[PDB]
Amino acid sequence: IINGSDCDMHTQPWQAALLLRPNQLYCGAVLVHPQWLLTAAHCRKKVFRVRLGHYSLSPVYESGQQMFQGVKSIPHPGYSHPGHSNDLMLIKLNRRIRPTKDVRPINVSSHCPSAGTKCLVSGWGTTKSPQVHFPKVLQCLNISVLSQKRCEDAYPRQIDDTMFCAGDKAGRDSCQGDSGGPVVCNGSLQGLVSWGDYPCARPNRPGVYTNLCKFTKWIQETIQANS
Numbered sequence: 001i002i003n004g005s006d007c008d009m010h011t012q013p014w015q016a017a018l019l020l021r022p023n024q025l026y027c028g029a030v031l032v033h034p035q036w037l038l039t040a041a042h043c044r045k046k047v048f049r050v051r052l053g054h055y056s057l058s059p060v061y062e063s064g065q066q067m068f069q070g071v072k073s074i075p076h077p078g079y080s081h082p083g084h085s086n087d088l089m090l091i092k093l094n095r096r097i098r099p100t101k102d103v104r105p106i107n108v109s110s111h112c113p114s115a116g117t118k119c120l121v122s123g124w125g126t127t128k129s130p131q132v133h134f135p136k137v138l139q140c141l142n143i144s145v146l147s148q149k150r151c152e153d154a155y156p157r158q159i160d161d162t163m164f165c166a167g168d169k170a171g172r173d174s175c176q177g178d179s180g181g182p183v184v185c186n187g188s189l190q191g192l193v194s195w196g197d198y199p200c201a202r203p204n205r206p207g208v209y210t211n212l213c214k215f216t217k218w219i220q221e222t223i224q225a226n227s
């Protein structure tokens with residue numbers, strides 16, 4: 001997250017981090033069900049761990065912490081390179097979460113975001129671009145949803161309704177390391193960090209996020225088919 005601020009503690013209980021030994025965080029994820037996470041399809045990995053209810057980046061022990069193992073990874077069937085449409089994937093935890101003020105799922109909105117909607121995106125990604133610089137703790141940033149028209153103009157021929165743009169204010173954007181992370185609007189999960197221009201936070205170049213309102217039926221049917 002470029003130009004964000006340390007998140008308040010306990011305000012992102014659905015935020016997750018994906019790690020692959022020792023504790024190298026490669027993507028964020030979002031707890032959307034007592035036993036399911038949602039992350040970007042390009043964040044797929046065979047072996048990895050899931051960390052929930054943990055504020056800092058380093059593996060410093062925290063009381064609210066809860067570690068898990070991903071038993072099943074299911075990317076949306078429409079995901080493809082280099083278009084990157086349908087950039088979402090379901091991950092099943094080995095066991096259900098112990099609900100607490102630290103670890104709590106969030107609902108996925110079925111109503112699509114309209115131009116002007118203020119949303120909050122969080123992550124442990126780099127706070128600088130192109131120079132890499134990781135934060136100490138979870139970063140938060142409010143971004144506003146642009147119109148699908150402007151979105152398409154900014155990235156001609158590389159955008160469809162499976163995504164949406166957000167982040168008008170310059171110097172502020174999501175970046176590498178935030179991928180798979182949540183974009184919350186109106187108390188609901190509206191999107192996942194997917195991609196954007198590079199370097200991050202270039203003026204008039206908004207971040208592109210997975211448009212989750214288009215996948216509620218698939219998400220719920222997939223979870224039920226594996227319960």
Ligand SMILES: *[C@H]1O[C@H](CO)[C@@H](O[C@@H]2O[C@H](CO)[C@@H](O)[C@H](O)[C@H]2NC(C)=O)[C@H](O)[C@H]1NC(C)=O
Pocket residue numbers: 005118120140141142
């Ligand atoms: C983005 O905007 C939201 C909403 O304006 C900010 O949330 C506000 O936070 C302050 C300080 O905690 C509260 O006094 C307000 O009540 C909150 N808004 C409301 C009315 O819900 C949020 O902090 C902003 N995100 C960041 C970190 O910039």
Ligand SMILES: [Zn+2]
Pocket residue numbers: 009010064102
């Ligand atoms: Zn706590």
Ligand SMILES: [Zn+2]
Pocket residue numbers: 080081082084
């Ligand atoms: Zn690709």
Ligand SMILES: [Zn+2]
Pocket residue numbers: 134
């Ligand atoms: Zn530092």
